[PDB]
Design an enzyme around this catalytic site. Structure first.
Site, mmCIF file in Angstrom:
data_model
loop_
_atom_site.group_PDB
_atom_site.id
_atom_site.type_symbol
_atom_site.label_atom_id
_atom_site.label_comp_id
_atom_site.label_asym_id
_atom_site.label_seq_id
_atom_site.Cartn_x
_atom_site.Cartn_y
_atom_site.Cartn_z
ATOM 1 N N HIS A 41 -2.435 97.036 9.497
ATOM 2 C CA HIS A 41 -2.599 97.644 8.339
ATOM 3 C C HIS A 41 -3.177 99.290 8.294
ATOM 4 O O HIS A 41 -2.926 98.788 6.696
ATOM 5 C CB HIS A 41 -3.286 96.791 7.430
ATOM 6 C CG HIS A 41 -5.016 96.190 7.717
ATOM 7 N ND1 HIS A 41 -5.029 95.388 8.287
ATOM 8 C CD2 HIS A 41 -6.088 98.304 8.122
ATOM 9 C CE1 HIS A 41 -6.973 95.463 8.026
ATOM 10 N NE2 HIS A 41 -7.502 96.701 8.073
ATOM 11 N N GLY A 143 -13.993 99.279 5.524
ATOM 12 C CA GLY A 143 -14.127 100.634 6.510
ATOM 13 C C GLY A 143 -14.913 100.244 7.629
ATOM 14 O O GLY A 143 -14.838 100.906 8.560
ATOM 15 N N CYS A 145 -13.472 97.897 9.566
ATOM 16 C CA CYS A 145 -11.899 97.112 9.918
ATOM 17 C C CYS A 145 -12.024 97.707 11.605
ATOM 18 O O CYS A 145 -12.025 98.855 11.774
ATOM 19 C CB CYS A 145 -10.718 97.007 9.338
ATOM 20 S SG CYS A 145 -10.371 96.043 7.782
HETATM 21 C C1 LIG Z 1 -11.761 92.432 0.448
HETATM 22 N N1 LIG Z 1 -10.750 91.803 0.658
HETATM 23 C C2 LIG Z 1 -10.620 92.031 2.255
HETATM 24 O O1 LIG Z 1 -11.108 92.750 3.013
HETATM 25 C C3 LIG Z 1 -8.956 91.065 2.084
HETATM 26 C C4 LIG Z 1 -8.584 90.459 1.468
HETATM 27 C C5 LIG Z 1 -7.546 89.768 2.420
HETATM 28 C C6 LIG Z 1 -7.377 88.621 1.693
HETATM 29 C C7 LIG Z 1 -8.023 87.725 1.022
HETATM 30 C C8 LIG Z 1 -7.592 88.096 -0.189
HETATM 31 C C9 LIG Z 1 -7.307 90.488 3.767
HETATM 32 C C10 LIG Z 1 -6.396 91.603 3.200
HETATM 33 N N2 LIG Z 1 -5.695 92.113 4.811
HETATM 34 O O2 LIG Z 1 -5.148 91.878 4.641
HETATM 35 O O3 LIG Z 1 -6.376 92.570 5.337
HETATM 36 C C11 LIG Z 1 -7.843 92.353 2.938
HETATM 37 N N3 LIG Z 1 -8.022 93.354 3.397
HETATM 38 C C12 LIG Z 1 -8.252 94.474 3.585
HETATM 39 C C13 LIG Z 1 -6.864 95.433 2.493
HETATM 40 C C14 LIG Z 1 -7.204 95.834 4.099
HETATM 41 C C15 LIG Z 1 -7.238 97.026 4.772
HETATM 42 C C16 LIG Z 1 -8.548 96.660 5.255
HETATM 43 C C17 LIG Z 1 -9.319 96.168 3.515
HETATM 44 N N4 LIG Z 1 -10.634 95.088 4.036
HETATM 45 C C18 LIG Z 1 -11.946 95.434 4.099
HETATM 46 O O4 LIG Z 1 -11.881 97.207 3.650
HETATM 47 C C19 LIG Z 1 -12.766 94.897 3.945
HETATM 48 C C20 LIG Z 1 -12.934 94.262 4.909
HETATM 49 C C21 LIG Z 1 -14.330 93.789 5.415
HETATM 50 O O5 LIG Z 1 -14.296 92.590 6.524
HETATM 51 N N5 LIG Z 1 -15.656 93.415 4.115
HETATM 52 C C22 LIG Z 1 -14.766 94.394 3.335
HETATM 53 C C23 LIG Z 1 -15.962 94.470 2.133
HETATM 54 C C24 LIG Z 1 -16.182 94.830 0.971
HETATM 55 C C25 LIG Z 1 -14.696 95.453 1.436
HETATM 56 C C26 LIG Z 1 -14.270 96.008 1.510
HETATM 57 C C27 LIG Z 1 -14.163 94.839 2.768
#
Ligand SMILES: CNC(=O)c1cc(C2CC2)cc([N+](=O)[O-])c1N[C@@H]1CCCC[C@@H]1NC(=O)c1cc(=O)[nH]c2ccccc12
Ligand SMILES: CNC(=O)c1cc(C2CC2)cc([N+](=O)[O-])c1N[C@@H]1CCCC[C@@H]1NC(=O)c1cc(=O)[nH]c2ccccc12
Lengths: 301, 302
Positions: A41, A143, A145
């Site tokens: 992603h 950040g 990931c």
């Molecule tokens: C916050 N929501 C998500 O993290 C997330 C949720 C879903 C579905 C449940 C709805 C799917 C994805 N997806 O498909 O990637 C998600 N991933 C996002 C989008 C892509 C890029 C990484 C990003 N995530 C983070 O940067 C991140 C990871 C973490 O462990 N903890 C955090 C704590 C505070 C803010 C961000 C994060």
């Protein structure tokens, strides 16, 4: 003596973390040999995540769209491919700090160490367990990931986890190092809910054997039970059903302590039906379930 | 989100862990530049630990009697000296993996990461805190002596602890990297008591702020309290008295959550008097005191 939630030394993994930038998105990567692994992603914008077409987005990317850096020095991308949910970036330089490594897909209940990273720099290390609902209770921010989970066997680094997303419940989902997600989760910014979580029963029992080996034995009663009677009480408390394999894995711990496994279940069944009454075991007022039988032996000997 | 007992990355400390053997006794050493630091009791036999005369025992030892091994490379000892309770062995080559480092004496209530080592090889890393009685609740076996505790400011490793002994109560004691013991302990195998311990109050409040940051807020009540009224409850439950310095250090976390410090003390005061009523806080049924205010901010901001 003493018993700590102990994590593997993170040195061999620190030498593999890099920073991966595609457009405005930045995450962490795993530099093994001349290949860099990262969550796919990274090629997506915020609007893309709502319903991404990864095959169409990746083909519209060239090798120069990826900025990879190990520390300050840059790594020239000379090839890119996709495997499930993990992006594979071919670089011109092989990592001189590549350890002997393996790609494993662990089972629910297994434990591993996590090296939380941001912008290719590690922030901290801690121990995790793969919950039965295929999530992990981690400590991840934006950040984070690309951070990976791992075990260490002698000199070999078994990579088992790569971080991808945080569920709305606060727990975290990810993939193995081949891109296959643990559990039914996808890398789409749509509402997903982790299933009903249960307690790893064989890990609770192993933690009780650790308390006995460390001198905590106030919970040992004088009764016994059967696997059928125990599991009947176990299901009501959302405890994973104890199988004969679990009884065998607790074998070595039962031998060193001289306490039968079915005897230890009766003490656990009593500790469940009666609570802890405010008492503590190994410094905890709850029942700890993130210690495998192998972790108990590796720490006490 | 989430909140784990997180330890510093241990890569920079791993490259300094060597093995030190003197006769049959083997323990771990810290190889920084061309000096190997280890507990001085490596020169003792099991009979000498009852009442050791380290000056006399060290005099009967020469450079070739110190076998220093770094993985598979054998180091050449060109000198030895004693500083307080640590032995300083000067070796042939400077350690190429030496990081930028400092030697620091930490205070009670502060935290650090322990790199548990056996026979010079790292075994695992975990975070712990210096108890108010100058002990640590660690996990150490035989041969763990020489393992060190440390903090990392940016690229500089702040070594603050070297392991020496396990007390009869199961807790652990050691020195700084200058050989001065934390607490009233001596490196002689005779009965020594750690003394009465207390609970680090400012750390519990910082942990409570970490719970609110991560969406755990059931313990917030509609009450407030004064500093003096809270300390009456604290002395009752064997908590360290809260000072004005503690209130000020919690300022940044109080601003990040919007919860006043005296309001948080009221919530902690209620928890101490009434318990938890069968609930959890950040996955714990106890009040955790091994997170400083700086540990929370570092973890919650990354
Ligand atoms: C916050 N929501 C998500 O993290 C997330 C949720 C879903 C579905 C449940 C709805 C799917 C994805 N997806 O498909 O990637 C998600 N991933 C996002 C989008 C892509 C890029 C990484 C990003 N995530 C983070 O940067 C991140 C990871 C973490 O462990 N903890 C955090 C704590 C505070 C803010 C961000 C994060
Ligand atoms: C078990 N007692 C001690 O450790 C100890 C106690 C005292 C006084 C309070 C009585 C003094 C010293 N001293 O002066 O060194 C002690 N240190 C011993 C003797 C010297 C050589 C290192 C050795 N330590 C260990 O092997 C060891 C360390 C540990 O953390 N945990 C263990 C768990 C199981 C068995 C051994 C250890």
């Amino acid at each position: 003596s003493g018993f700590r939630k102990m994590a593997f030394p993170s040195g061999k993994v620190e030498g593999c973390m890099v920073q991966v930038t595609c457009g405005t998105t930045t995450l962490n990567g795993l530099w093994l040999d001349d290949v860099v692994y990262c969550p796919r992603h990274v090629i997506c914008t915020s609007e893309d995540m709502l319903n991404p077409n990864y095959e169409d987005l990746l083909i519209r990317k060239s090798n120069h769209n990826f900025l990879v850096q190990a520390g300050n020095v840059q790594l020239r991308v000379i090839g890119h491919s996709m495997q499930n949910c993990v992006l594979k970036l071919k670089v011109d330089t092989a990592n001189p700090k590549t350890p002997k490594y393996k790609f494993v897909r662990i089972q629910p209940g297994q434990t591993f160490s996590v090296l939380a990273c941001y912008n290719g720099s590690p922030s901290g290390v801690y121990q995790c367990a793969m919950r039965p609902n295929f999530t992990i209770k981690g400590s991840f921010l934006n950040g984070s990931c690309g951070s990976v989970g791992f075990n260490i066997d002698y000199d070999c680094v078994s990579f088992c986890y790569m971080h991808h997303m945080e569920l709305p419940t606060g727990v975290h989902a990810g993939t193995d190092l081949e891109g296959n997600f643990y559990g039914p989760f996808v890398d789409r910014q749509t509402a997903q809910a982790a299933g009903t979580d249960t307690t790893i029963t064989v890990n609770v029992l192993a933690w009780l054997y650790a308390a006995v080996i460390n001198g905590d034995r106030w919970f040992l009663n004088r009764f016994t039970t059967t696997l059928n009677d125990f599991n009947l009480v176990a299901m009501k408390y959302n405890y994973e059903p104890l199988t004969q394999d679990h009884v065998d894995i607790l074998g070595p711990l039962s031998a060193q302590t001289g306490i039968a496994v079915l005897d230890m279940c009766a003490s656990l069944k009593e500790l469940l039906q009666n609570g802890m009454n405010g008492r503590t075991i190994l410094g905890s007022a709850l029942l700890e379930d993130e210690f495998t039988p192998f972790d108990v032996v590796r720490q006490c000997s």
